[PDB]
Amino acid sequence: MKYIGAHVSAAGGLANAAIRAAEIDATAFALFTKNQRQWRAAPLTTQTIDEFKAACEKYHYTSAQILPHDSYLINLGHPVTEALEKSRDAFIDEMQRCEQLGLSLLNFHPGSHLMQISEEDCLARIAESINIALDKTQGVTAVIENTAGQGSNLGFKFEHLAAIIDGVEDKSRVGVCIDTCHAFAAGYDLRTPAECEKTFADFARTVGFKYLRGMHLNDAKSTFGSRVDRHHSLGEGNIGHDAFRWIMQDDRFDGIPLILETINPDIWAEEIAWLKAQQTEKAVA
């Protein structure tokens, strides 16, 4: 079974994310559990937690179907150790919020070296950040998202993801999420079925599908290899519709949240319905 949805708004409270997902007939969703800017969020109340859990149960969203995203301001590889510690504090807080909400996954971009430390050293700092958070929480898997590679952001090569995982002690609570826009921007082609298979065999050799815990299904406004992160609605960007048919027809993408971060929320219900239909419509190679 595939689980298909969108990164919906949590405006008016976390439970409204589940309600919004249900209104677009999603079978998965993503959300932020707090505003991104605030270093430290007011603690979750018992009232917020119960309303969230009640809405998830009303609309049949289990923990396996929900892929929260951390704040973009967290840098788990920060070269300034005092800033690293503040990012680690925020990440532990985000992981604790997930635990309190009954969530089992947390998706995050790995980090950035700010031209002050080597790639190797930044990746090692990120693995240690994960280890710290996993020692301070229970039941939540740290899901590393690949990136477009803008600026000094790491995670644009699959080998980066594998290097982080190698440094994680409890590998049962680490995984990865592949964002199709990010992959394409980083130079992994997706424009034909053959190219999709080439990209995912590379993923299999370097990381392995045993670590795959989510996908972000985005077309790309930016161009191939541009190392620019600009999403587009399915079919409207430079990837095109065939990659998404290919993903929907491949059983390796079952059982995990498949999340739109496409740029027109008015068509999310149509994008979700189209994705569901491609599972059984005309086969691509």
- Helix or strand run (H / E) with residue 143: strand 141-145
Q: How many CB atoms lie within 10 A of CB 62?
A: 12
In the complex with Zn ion, the residue whose CB is nearer, 216 or 221, is 216
Check: CB of residue 144 under 8 Å from CB of residue 207.
no
How near is the Cβ of 259 to Zn ion at its closest, in Å? 7
Find the binding residues for Zn ion in span 198-227 (CB under 5 A): 216
d(CA 171, CA 95): 16
How near is the Cβ of 27 to Zn ion at its closest, in Å? 18
216 marked among binding-site residues? yes
Q: Is 121 a catalytic residue?
A: no
Q: How many CB atoms lie within 10 A of CB 72?
A: 11
In the complex with Zn ion, the residue whose CB is nearer, 94 or 179, is 179
C-alpha distance from residue 19 to each of 14, 56, 81, 266 (Å): 9, 8, 40, 16
Q: Which residue, 175, 165, 172, 168, is CA-closest to 215?
A: 175
Q: Give yes or no for residue 179 binding Zn ion (CB under 5 A).
A: yes
Across-strand partners of 153? 112
Phi-psi region of 40 (alpha: psi -120 to 50; beta: other; left: phi over 0): beta
Q: Is 99 a catalytic residue?
A: no
Given the structure tokens 């604790």, which residue do they identify? Answer: 96
In the complex with Zn ion, the residue whose CB is nearer, 74 or 123, is 74
166 marked among binding-site residues? no
How near is the Cβ of 58 to Zn ion at its closest, in Å? 27
- Work out which of 229, 238, 247, 256 binds Zn ion, going by CB under 5 A: 229
Site string for Zn ion, 67-86 (x = CB under 5 A): --------------------
Q: How many CB atoms lie within 10 A of CB 80?
A: 13
70 marked among binding-site residues? no
Q: Is 232 a catalytic residue?
A: no
Which residue positions form the known binding site for Zn(2+)?
A: 69, 109, 145, 179, 182, 216, 229, 231, 261
Q: Which residues are catalytic?
A: 37, 69, 72, 109, 145, 179, 182, 216, 229, 231, 261
Give the interface with Zn ion as residue ranges (CB under 5 A). 145, 179, 216, 229
Which residue positions form the known binding site?
A: 69, 109, 145, 179, 182, 216, 229, 231, 261
